């Protein structure tokens, strides 16, 4: 406890990225990307144990227990908030410590296109940001809330597993319910959403069914819902989301989807061609009449031939038209663009073209 | 009547890898993949009871008498760690107990070829060792993690059912998880690896979809990704990745494959001419700029043309010129060089040549 605060003072001190603690090293720091020791001995198992507890609450003690994983957020006060990431190895505990910053980027800084200020804007519907894990998909949310926020009079609630980005009121009222906490689950906090007069709501990822007809819901009755999945393209991300459903009940969820989807976008970060740091590819699908007859017809897979010709009108954007884009600007090279692109053929026809 | 004991030090100084302990039998030791009876009379069921209870705590017997079944390691301190599995057949206790080395070959103990070594340095990508039950995939996954953890300043998570060679940290941090104690699963432990802040990461067998798409995308989010099959070939092995896809998402699998993938490895281990030992058969693939292309354009097919002719340059080497090789070196004899290669007609050709 006193120590864990002196462990995590020394991470922000010396810039380092994560602190890991595991047995039979010294806390290590991640330090431009290489790992380096503290000059410290080395922890044994009571020592990370009680390194790791000391910042947990009873519901996440039981929880880590219980499962052996737990995701977390947790500030420390007058340093920074920080995301914790606790499991076991060999018997014993271990955690990975990241920062979370205080202050959110702008569209700009994060090279999102036009089109998604706009997503922003969107009195209703259903707006997805998809994929992998560390894709920059919180970072994008936490920009397109931080707008609404700024921009808007009205409410908006979120549900995170954990809370990672706070926003303080501006002026919209904001409420943010953390899992586990705030309120017992997903399911339990979503029961009670449209008793408290929401406009604008994060669902978190659509992890099963019962949290994507609530999504639906939401976004079916009037309201601005924003979820995420891991899927890497839109024509991918509207397939996971109808085939979990039972076969019997799959058109339905084609149906509610063609009307409540305003957006899907997937992104993923690429190393820059410098050397030194990463930039956003997106693929941006914004639903014109024709996808979401496809959507109804379940024809999704003709959908990604009506993303490649609605570019001007909505701001829409395949994956490869993305890379292509990224390519003429030199902000990656030939080889990231085409080790990446879901097509590299199609890619290859774009720029003798 | 003979005891544990001397029955594990006989095991282990014969250079065996598993005890058998049943009825009816005596013990019998299994040297370079068959069993040997040891001098001894036959066991009876007082003699396998008292004989795999020697070796048990008393919350060990509880469990197995509660379910006929069990599964534990334990040590003898002057010997080795070791592996028992304790079950019941025909009314009387059966026992089957494997060896667990310490220590770790060197590359050229275990008779992998230089291009192996250089894996080791690879920044990101997906590594597959290939082969079915014993043919050394875990020892040789062994000899490159060790590499890593000498050379590196990077962190390394192994998921492992069970763990097998111990790490202790070098430069490297290095986490091992055993799925069943230290995660539930693998699915779990890949559930949480993204956000472990992981740079080489062991996730085992390729078993289904779901462990593919988790593979390619640590490989594709800049991770060094080590990951097995039990294919026989290069070309099986990217085969049997691909085709368990839909055949609409194996154009991305392909790409994927062909950006990702920096080397396969698909052994077997063939008894020794002289009647003692077992030597490694291995056939090594490292994508070139061409095999890439060829995986792009779906020409599998013609990937063994290339790996007859990248012999000097990259060190490839198809299986039926491991042979030749083992053959000219008397290493193995004739009939066993014949029965593994997968065309006798070429490896005869090779001969008279
Ligand atoms: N548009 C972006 N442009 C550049 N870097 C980004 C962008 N989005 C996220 N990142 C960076 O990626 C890293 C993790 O992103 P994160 O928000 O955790 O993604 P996710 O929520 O999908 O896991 C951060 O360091 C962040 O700065
Ligand atoms: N590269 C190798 N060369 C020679 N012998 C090996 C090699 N790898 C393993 N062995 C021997 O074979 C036995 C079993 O192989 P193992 O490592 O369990 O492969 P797998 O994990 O695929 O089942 C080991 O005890 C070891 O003595």
Redesign the interface.
Same mark, same amino acid.
Do not use: C, I, Y
């Given at each position: 406890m006193a120590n864990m605060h002196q462990l995590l003072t020394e991470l922000v001190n010396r810039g380092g990225?994560?602190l890991?603690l595991?047995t039979?090293?010294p806390p290590?720091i991640?330090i431009d990307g290489?790992?380096?020791p503290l000059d410290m001995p080395p922890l044994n198992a009571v020592d990370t144990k009680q390194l790791c507890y000391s910042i947990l609450t009873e519901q996440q003690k039981h929880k880590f227990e219980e499962?052996?994983?737990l995701?977390l957020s947790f500030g420390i006060k007058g340093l920074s908030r920080f995301?914790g990431?606790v499991? !076991?190895? &060999?018997?014993a505990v271990?955690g !990975?410590f &990241?920062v979370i910053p205080y202050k959110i980027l702008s569209f700009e800084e994060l090279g999102l296109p036009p089109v998604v200020r706009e997503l922003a804007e969107k009195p209703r519907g259903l707006v997805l940001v998809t994929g992998?894990?560390?894709?920059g998909k919180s970072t994008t949310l936490a920009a397109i809330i931080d707008k609404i926020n700024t921009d808007r009079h009205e409410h908006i609630v979120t549900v995170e597993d954990p809370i990672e980005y706070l926003h303080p009121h501006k002026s919209c009222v904001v409420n943010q319910r953390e899992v586990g906490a705030d309120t017992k689950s997903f399911k339990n906090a979503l029961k009670y959403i449209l008793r408290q007069d929401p406009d604008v709501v994060l669902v978190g990822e659509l992890r099963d069914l019962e949290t994507i007809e609530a999504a639906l819901t939401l976004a079916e009755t009037g309201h601005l819902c924003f979820a995420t999945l891991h899927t890497n393209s839109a024509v991918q991300t509207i397939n996971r989301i109808v085939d979990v459903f039972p076969s019997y009940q799959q058109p339905q969820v084609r149906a509610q989807l063609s009307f409540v989807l305003e957006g899907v976008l997937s992104q993923?970060?690429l190393?820059k061609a410098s050397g030194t740091g990463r930039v956003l590819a997106i693929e941006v699908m914004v639903p014109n009449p024709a996808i979401r007859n496809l959507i109804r017809e379940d024809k999704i897979?003709q959908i990604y031939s009506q993303m490649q010709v609605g570019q001007e009108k909505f701001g829409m954007m395949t994956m490869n038209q993305c890379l292509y884009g990224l390519l003429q600007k030199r902000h990656i090279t030939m080889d990231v663009g085409?080790?990446?692109?879901?097509?590299?053929?199609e890619l290859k026809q774009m720029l003798t073209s």
């Open positions: 990225s994560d890991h595991t039979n090293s290590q991640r290489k790992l380096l499962n052996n994983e995701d995301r990431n499991f !076991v190895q &060999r018997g271990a !990975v &990241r992998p894990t560390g894709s993923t970060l190393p897979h085409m080790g990446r692109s879901p097509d590299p053929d």
